[PDB]
Amino acid sequence: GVEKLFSLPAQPLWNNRLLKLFTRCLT
Amino acid sequence: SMSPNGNLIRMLVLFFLESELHEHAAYLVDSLWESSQELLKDWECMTELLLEEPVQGEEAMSDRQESALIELMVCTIRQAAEAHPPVGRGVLTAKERKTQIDDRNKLTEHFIITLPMLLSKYSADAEKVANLLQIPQYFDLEIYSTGRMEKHLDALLKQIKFVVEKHVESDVLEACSKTYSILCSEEYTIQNRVDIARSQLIDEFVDRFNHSVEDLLDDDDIYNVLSTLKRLTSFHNAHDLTKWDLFGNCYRLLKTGIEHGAMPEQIVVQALQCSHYSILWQLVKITDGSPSKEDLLVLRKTVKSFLAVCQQCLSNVNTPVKEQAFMLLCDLLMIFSHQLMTGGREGLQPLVFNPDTGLQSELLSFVMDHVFIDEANKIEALHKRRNLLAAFSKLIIYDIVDMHAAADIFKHYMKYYNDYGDIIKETLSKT
């Protein structure tokens, strides 16, 4: 639910290397 | 043809259709997987139904019945390779672990040959292709070289290129882009052969896109620029197209769609989307390497230019352009925040972009007109609005925008009956 929304960017990144940029700013 | 189960499977498709659990395809396969495992793995039978004639005396399959078989087929491929129930029905033993290996070999060796045939017969069907392209992920890509079956790899890449050039659906292009990334898995053997095939496909569309923009500077000239760019955008999402100069024509498409407003909404959405991936891809090379200070500045200039374009697009007349430009701003401000330097990456001080209060006001103002307002489309739009609010809520929690105005405003709009209640309660708590 909201956990998936607050963990992933608004525009979905298909490549994991790109998605790491948004995830490294979390936790 | 060969397999007798042709009657059993042709009626499993029927039992799935006529019972209307349309969104339980992966659930239906998991249900009858403990008892009917051997029937559901007869992919030879399934390919025969789709590819072979039904022989005189028998009645052919309908278009929908053929789409249901593919959907059921790919679920069987998933259940066999992954060896666990799908999402919704959440360790292996010794025999189960061995069977998983043989099942991967059987499904790979069968579909290395038959997948390009399936794609070829049903190339003009967007729904079917998007399902057929979900199979290579479960392949054991060593067999392409162990069995010396590179002859069939080219047939697959030839059919993938065929699907791309005659389809503009966003879901189909998504499946193609993800498949080419799997075939470039960098594992070992086939990494080289796929690259040449990938660069051929990109080159043939970078030209058909650049030369198509020069004609737009007409109703048919519009469709030429849109179709050629939408394909590049989906591929630029998953593949580093930085060696090509795609930002050049993407900026020019925006710098004259803002100055004049003559640009159509859909072309702006793709041009904005394409440029977002280019910047993100340029940032990955700067982050992983040991770059020079010039590199940070040329990327600093490129990011600053795009952020300005996104702010101007907030005042576009078309709502989709307004919607698209908002999500990219929330993502970039989060990627290019003070968290970007975290992790010993202090050599990224210039790339950090903090939003001024003038932009923070425009973002909050966008939430006021498109999130807080007064059956398949209202549930479609409800998720559309919840994604926008969650994107802004991220900026508040991580101290990227000032929270005191946004916090008070969210407390005043909590009259939306759980529409945003779970989202709002979470953002208010984290303060």
Numbering used by the authors:
A (entry chain D): 368 to 394
B (entry chain B): 457 to 546, 551 to 677, 684 to 840, 855 to 911
Provide the publication's sentences verbatim.
The complex consists of a tripartite ring comprising SMC1, SMC3, and RAD21 (also called SCC1 or Mcd1), which associates with a conserved peripheral fourth subunit that, in human somatic cells, is represented by two paralogs of the Scc3/STAG protein family, STAG1 or STAG2. The STAG1 protein is composed of HEAT repeats, a tandem repeat structural motif composed of two α helices linked by a short loop. STAG1 and STAG2, therefore, function redundantly in somatic mammalian cells to mediate sister chromatid cohesion, an event essential for cell viability during proliferation.
The STAG1 central region consists of HEAT repeats R6-R14 (residues 459–915), and the structure has been determined both alone and in complex with a 40–amino acid residue RAD21 peptide (spanning residues 356–395) to 2.3 and 3.1 Å, respectively (site VI). The site IV interaction interface is extensive (>1,200 Å2 in area, with 12 hydrogen bonds and 1 salt bridge) and, in contrast to the situation in sites I and II, consists of a mixture of polar and nonpolar interfaces. The two helical regions of the peptide contribute to mostly hydrophobic interactions with buried side chains, whereas the extended loop forms extensive hydrogen-bonded interactions mostly of the form STAG1 side chain to RAD21 main chain. Overall, most of the contacts in site IV are conserved between STAG1 and STAG2. The first 12 residues of the RAD21 peptide, which form a further short section of α-helix in the STAG2 structure are disordered in the electron density and have not been included in the model. At this site, the side chains of STAG1 D797 form hydrogen bonds with the backbone amide residues A377 and Q378 in RAD21. These residues have previously been implicated in interaction with residue D793 in STAG2. Importantly, the STAG1 mutations D797K and D797A in site IV strongly reduced the binding to SMC1, SMC3, and RAD21.
